[PDB]
Amino acid sequence: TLRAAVFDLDGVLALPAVFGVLGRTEEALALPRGLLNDAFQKGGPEGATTRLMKGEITLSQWIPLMEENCRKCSETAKVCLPKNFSIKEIFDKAISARKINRPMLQAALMLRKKGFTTAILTNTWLDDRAERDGLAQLMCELKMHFDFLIESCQVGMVKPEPQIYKFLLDTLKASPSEVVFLDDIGANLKPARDLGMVTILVQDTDTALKELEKVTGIQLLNTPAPLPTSCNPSDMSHGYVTVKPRVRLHFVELGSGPAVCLCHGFPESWYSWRYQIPALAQAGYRVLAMDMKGYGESSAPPEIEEYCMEVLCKEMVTFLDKLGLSQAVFIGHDWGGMLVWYMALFYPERVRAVASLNTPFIPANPNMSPLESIKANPVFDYQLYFQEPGVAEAELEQNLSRTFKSLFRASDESVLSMHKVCEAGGLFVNSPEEPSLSRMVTEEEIQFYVQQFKKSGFRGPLNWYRNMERNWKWACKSLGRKILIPALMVTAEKDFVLVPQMSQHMEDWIPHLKRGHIEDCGHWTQMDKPTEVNQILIKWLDSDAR
Amino acid sequence: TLRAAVFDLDGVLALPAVFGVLGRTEEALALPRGLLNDAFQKGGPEGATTRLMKGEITLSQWIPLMEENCRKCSETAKVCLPKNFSIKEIFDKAISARKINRPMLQAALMLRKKGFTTAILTNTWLDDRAERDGLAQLMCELKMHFDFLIESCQVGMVKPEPQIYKFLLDTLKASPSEVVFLDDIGANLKPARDLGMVTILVQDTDTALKELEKVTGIQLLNTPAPLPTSCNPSDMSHGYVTVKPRVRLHFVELGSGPAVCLCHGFPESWYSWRYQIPALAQAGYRVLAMDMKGYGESSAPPEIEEYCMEVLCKEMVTFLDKLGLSQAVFIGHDWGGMLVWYMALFYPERVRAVASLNTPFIPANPNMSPLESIKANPVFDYQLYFQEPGVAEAELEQNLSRTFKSLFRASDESVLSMHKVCEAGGLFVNSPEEPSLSRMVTEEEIQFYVQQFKKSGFRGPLNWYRNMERNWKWACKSLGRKILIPALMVTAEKDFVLVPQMSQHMEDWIPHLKRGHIEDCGHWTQMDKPTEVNQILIKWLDSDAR
Ligand SMILES: O=C(N[C@H]1CC[C@H](Oc2ccc(C(=O)O)cc2)CC1)N[C@]12C[C@H]3C[C@H](C[C@H](C3)C1)C2
Ligand SMILES: O=C(N[C@H]1CC[C@H](Oc2ccc(C(=O)O)cc2)CC1)N[C@]12C[C@H]3C[C@H](C[C@H](C3)C1)C2
Ligand SMILES: [Mg+2]
Ligand SMILES: [Mg+2]
């Protein structure tokens, strides 16, 4: 019967609640118990705080009004306000003190995921303080997880006036006995209850959630750790840059701060970074997640040379130029890993910082051609299979669903063997027509890749593998050099192709290299261990790219 | 006969040249005359500086090599290097000391504009210093004005080796006697001369330009002050955000730094900011130049209400949300001016700073309906003409070329009279079929607007005018408030509709308002006085939005 969930902000989604700072200030400054709240509520519906909450005045017009109220309250109580008493000062501290209440948000997340219509209903103000950005951030981080945000100052009404609940029920397209409403102030529940809404006084979070769990019949507390926030492709800002006449580059863009350019692998998508894209934006970064040349909404010229490393790097630099970026942090995985390394080597001035997932920096062997090298490793066999234009395209484009369902697997979940692919005559010869969904990806996620590769298919992506000679000659020009910009390498325990030991010799070329390791991690790092990936990168960026 | 122009960087496009810092350091530190240059050149083609310039090593590998050379040079010269001697320190100072040489660049600009193939040919290095971004910036600002940039370290060759000139002539698709090459070091000219290229030793800039003027037969020196850099639409990064299911917003994006959101007027385009977009990017800003709802590549639903101020503002906030921006600076002109003001009023938390060109902040008259107000001013007549869905669309869409050629005029150049448009029965009744091109815009610029308005025409844009009642009711909710965030107002002397006196009362609502005035400026401010506009905004942003 419950179909909707409403959360107060202050005291429910954010802690500590600003009303409690009022008590601790009183206590701190040894003021009469409740003085600050008497002054705050002064005049009830005709008072300054209602005008604020109704949106009639801004937070800065309100500040001196509240000071007066404190004077009037302190006079009436026959005490003297302390020297250098400052309402601005106090509210600054208070507002910046509050953070998202993780357990509660995730509870709301869960409820939405099981299909509830969730909303924030809050009395709040038009904040014009020089420090308003802080609160602006919080509300941003919070609003993306809810169907609605109803702000007292935006709708001209306040809790606990009955009108706002009607507005709430209207906005929800629900009837009162279908909503649960959580709030920390009892007065505000009264009117929700009168309409027949389930209510919860939120004192301590956990108890509030136990009640919520009980009423909804969904497990909220003690539940498993949820995935990082993902991306709905159509809620994203999509960018397009022509880097030369044939060729356009597409990216997805989120956040502000230092520019971070995410470079996916074979055969993937900007979408392979769906778990990183929110995290880093939230961490303070401008994330530019590429469709690498040949993929998705990016161009895919058919010629092989269009995909050698030199051209691909030139084109990334041009990307920076047209977009006005003097530098960006480069982070790549798989093929994208290889490319960001060479970016560091040929264009240090344009690379703020470099990092790679799984892809070690391997230098060219001036003495042994890459064809020889690739033969020297059985696990590289599939690469020779990729050389003959047409063969791999045909196998891979034959059933897309099948292809990605088969590639995108966690460690325990392997259904292919990159071992003697050539001999076998294909990648899929002894793997299933209809592989099971891997635990890492949903049917919907797989279909996204499916719809993308329908645009250009595999020629472009496969071409990346077809310039072994050209890339080797090129790479050799950099044998003299060293990587001295900040650099992170991140290894995946259970990558059975990009094994962590391939990275062992990296400090020889990259003396200040920083490292990350991820246990129980296959080749598809971002979607296998998104929490860990986010943790390692954000930590790295904060110390090294700022 | 001359068809191409090549410019050295160090000493030609950038001053002071780093070789001269070497002399002044020597002089500063009382070292043997030339010691620093002996050490720099040490070993000629087998030396460290060649490897650097050839790209064999990075600038940071080079640094200690150069120190050794100084030791060896100082030993041989029987002097002791000073306590705390630091090549890094010296090159840091030097590189950061150099700036673009305005007269020279503009000379190159001019030559390109009269059809020359221009290029930079320079010996230079792979810079991995922690401070490489500085130089990265300079090269960015410089490379956008030239057909080619040939870097010694990128092509593996150096001036004055003859191979690089061959490469140069190849890249240019020119024969030697069609190029002029400017350089400050004589040795480098020698090989250009051997092939039969016109050359210029660049000592003082002005003399170099006099020779250049003489050889090319184009006036370079003493020439009129050129326009700010414009934008080629197809060299820009284009962004797309769906703000709700019907409706997508398109923007053009350039630069990094604080987010600046540019809001054009009626009936215009992101392209109306073409002169501001580079300037601000160069000034340190992330410029997001909108197609406002109803225009260009943005959506244009036909319903009027889709265009009231409230919806338009909601949708801008959503724009921020989906793009991950907690705030941005809002700058608008005309209708966009009106909108940024209301943004400040209803969403201060999301507005870092607000500024308007021509559009004063006028509050609603709670007592007099907007229809009455608009009748009270003869110069507003055209607005009543705009009310009847269909009438204005038909006149305006009938000849697009004609429409914009007629609207987009400088002050002296007026061909319409917004006076008694209704009575006359149209905007164009006694104006020409084929107006002359106004001095502000080229045929190509006008055609750009033409091709844009072909997409949705005038319904959307005109609809902005059709919510006088709705916007008035809405605006009234803010009668209690004040604008206390940083705010600039910029008036145009010769705006015969948005006259500067309409702004006189603004300090009553906006007490810290900052002001800008532009003399000899019509209504189409950005394209009328781009230099002034850029000057006022950049100055304002630097003090107020940072
Ligand atoms: O080949 C590269 N990635 C493969 C892409 C497909 C994937 O297939 C898998 C992966 C996992 C599984 C599973 O879990 O069963 C199955 C199939 C295997 C890895 N990356 C490079 C990166 C650089 C440059 C060049 C040479 C070398 C170094 C490898 C390409
Ligand atoms: O009408 C608005 N702009 C017009 C657009 C077209 C232009 O036509 C011109 C302009 C110049 C010339 C010339 O040089 O001959 C000819 C025609 C006249 C100005 N802007 C607003 C901005 C706010 C909100 C609302 C009401 C009021 C306050 C005016 C719209
Ligand atoms: Mg509360
Ligand atoms: Mg020079």
Coordinates of N, CA, C and O and ligand atoms in Angstrom, one line a residue, chain A residues 8-12 17 19 159 183-185 188, ligand 3:
Chain A
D8 N 12.4 15.0 5.2 CA 12.9 16.3 5.7 C 14.4 16.4 5.3 O 15.0 15.3 5.1
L9 N 14.9 17.6 5.2 CA 16.4 17.7 5.0 C 17.0 17.9 6.4 O 17.5 16.9 7.0
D10 N 17.1 19.1 6.9 CA 17.6 19.4 8.2 C 17.1 18.5 9.3 O 16.0 18.6 9.8
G11 N 18.0 17.6 9.7 CA 17.7 16.7 10.8 C 17.4 15.3 10.3 O 17.4 14.3 11.1
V12 N 17.2 15.1 9.0 CA 16.9 13.8 8.4 C 17.9 13.4 7.3 O 18.7 12.5 7.5
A17 N 21.4 19.1 12.6 CA 20.4 20.1 12.2 C 20.7 21.5 12.8 O 21.1 21.6 14.0
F19 N 19.0 23.8 14.1 CA 18.3 24.1 15.3 C 19.1 23.7 16.6 O 19.0 24.3 17.6
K159 N 6.2 24.3 6.2 CA 5.8 23.3 7.3 C 5.7 24.2 8.5 O 6.5 25.0 8.8
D183 N 10.4 13.4 9.5 CA 10.8 14.7 10.0 C 11.3 14.6 11.4 O 11.0 13.7 12.1
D184 N 12.2 15.6 11.8 CA 12.7 15.5 13.2 C 11.9 16.4 14.2 O 12.2 16.4 15.4
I185 N 11.0 17.2 13.7 CA 10.2 18.1 14.5 C 8.7 17.7 14.5 O 8.1 17.5 13.4
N188 N 5.6 19.3 12.7 CA 5.5 19.1 11.2 C 4.9 17.8 10.8 O 4.4 17.7 9.7
Ligands
MG3 MG 14.0 19.4 10.4

